[PDB]
Design a protein around this ligand. Structure first.
Ligand code: ANP
Ligand code: ATP
Ligand code: ORD
Ligand code: MG
Ligand code: MG
Length: 353
């Protein structure tokens, strides 16, 4: 049995934790927040700030197989970077890749320098898509029809949002599984589903990874626009939502793959279906789709229910949020499981959708 130590107890952390358990690893969580979201989901939980008490972490590091940072707190990351050489286990992170990826303008310079199409900056014609430079979860993302000098203003590119994760080991870059990112009115993601292979997207994602070169995990988001594919961002860190769907649809566990990238090495390159979504239990148990930004306001997050083809997790708080996962051999069965799941909530927990 392997033990993974996660630094970060929210959504990134949940996904890593969730996938570590499928790989049957013990999961140890470090988080500075006593009310860390997944605090009861992890096998062990140590509440401390790693910048304040680095020694506790280095110590943990003597007793785990790997440390995975799963937060986007730049102080935390830079700090981890400055002490990484002292861990007694691999640190499953690419810090240089993260440096380009967290800055959206920098990421766009990177796209351009390797010939990858990306929304045009500062167009004159409305609409403009505008969003902060270094956020995630689409915090601040907005359509427009006095921002900052550094706000990104882009052409609005209509069409589907699509995601691919790549795991690299520095030499080989394993492009995994395409997913469809369903967005809500806040440009947040409330649902993910898997897509058919897309070779162009796959080759672009390989090049992005290979020119770093990536050692660790990144995701590539693209919009399939009316004038072709446009990469809008990359995020070099363990993602939430999509790896679960990649797991059921493709059979690949990204935590497993990420762990191999820093040990064995990885090699390059199922076809089941999976639906993954968030639904807020609203007043009178009317169900409302919500994005990550809501789920992440929660107070406790753990497993609620499971039967074959159906997992349900409850994020407790100011209106509970349910994360549902359904899967099966094809869209049909999955849809059938989605129905059974909803009817579990409906008949037993008073829900209505
Ligand atoms: N130029 C654009 N045109 C149209 N929609 C866009 C554009 N840029 C971003 N979006 C939408 O807004 C969402 C958030 O933008 P994105 O640039 O992917 O970064 P992020 O906030 O750092 N989110 P993440 O993928 O969670 O880490 C995207 O998923 C798209 O749905
Ligand atoms: N230096 C640190 N030491 C320990 N845990 C940390 C540190 N920095 C962040 N975390 C934890 O990682 C998780 C995700 O942090 P991140 O900043 O990516 O998201 P966030 O939504 O901004 O978190 P927060 O609730 O603090 O705003 C949080 O639970 C946070 O407490
Ligand atoms: N890889 C696409 C996932 C988007 C969002 N859940 C995130 O972690 O950025
Ligand atoms: Mg992003
Ligand atoms: Mg994004």
């Amino acid at each position: 049995m392997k033990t993974i130590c996660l630094v970060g107890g929210k959504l990134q952390g949940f996904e890593a934790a969730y996938l570590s358990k499928k790989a049957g690893m013990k999961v140890v969580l470090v988080d500075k927040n006593p009310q860390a979201l997944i605090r009861n989901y992890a096998d062990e939980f140590y509440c401390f700030d790693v910048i304040k008490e680095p020694e506790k972490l280095l110590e943990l590091s003597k007793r785990v197989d790997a440390v995975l940072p799963v937060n986007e707190n730049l102080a935390c990351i830079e700090f981890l970077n400055s002490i990484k050489e002292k861990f007694s286990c691999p640190v499953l992170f690419d810090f240089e890749a993260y440096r380009i990826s967290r800055d959206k303008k920098k990421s766009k310079d990177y796209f351009k320098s390797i010939g990858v199409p990306t929304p045009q900056d500062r167009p004159s014609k409305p609409p403009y898509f505008v969003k902060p430079p270094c956020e995630s979860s689409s915090v601040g993302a907005r359509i427009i029809y006095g921002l900052e000098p550094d706000t990104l203003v882009e052409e609005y590119v209509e069409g589907e949002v699509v995601s691919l994760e790549v795991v690299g080991d520095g030499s080989h870059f394993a492009v995994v599984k395409e997913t469809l990112v369903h967005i809500d009115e806040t440009y947040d993601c409330h649902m993910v589903t898997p897509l058919p292979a897309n070779p162009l997207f796959r080759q672009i994602s390989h090049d992005l990874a290979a020119n770093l070169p990536l050692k660790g995990i990144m995701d590539v988001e693209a919009i399939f626009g009316p004038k072709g594919l446009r990469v809008i961002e990359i995020d070099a860190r363990f993602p939430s939502q999509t790896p679960t769907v990649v797991y059921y649809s493709s059979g690949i566990n990204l935590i497993e793959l990420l762990f191999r990238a820093f040990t064995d090495g990885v090699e390059e390159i199922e076809n089941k279906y999976c639906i993954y979504e968030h639904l807020m239990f609203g007043e009178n148990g009317v169900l409302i789709p919500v994005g990550e930004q809501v789920l992440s306001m929660g107070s406790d997050y753990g497993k609620f229910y499971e039967e074959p083809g159906i997992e349900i997790f409850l994020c407790k708080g100011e209106y509970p949020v349910f994360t549902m996962v359904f899967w099966g051999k094809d869209r049909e069965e999955t849809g059938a499981k989605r129905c059974k799941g909803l009817s579990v909530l409906k008949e037993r927990f008073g829900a209505v959708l």
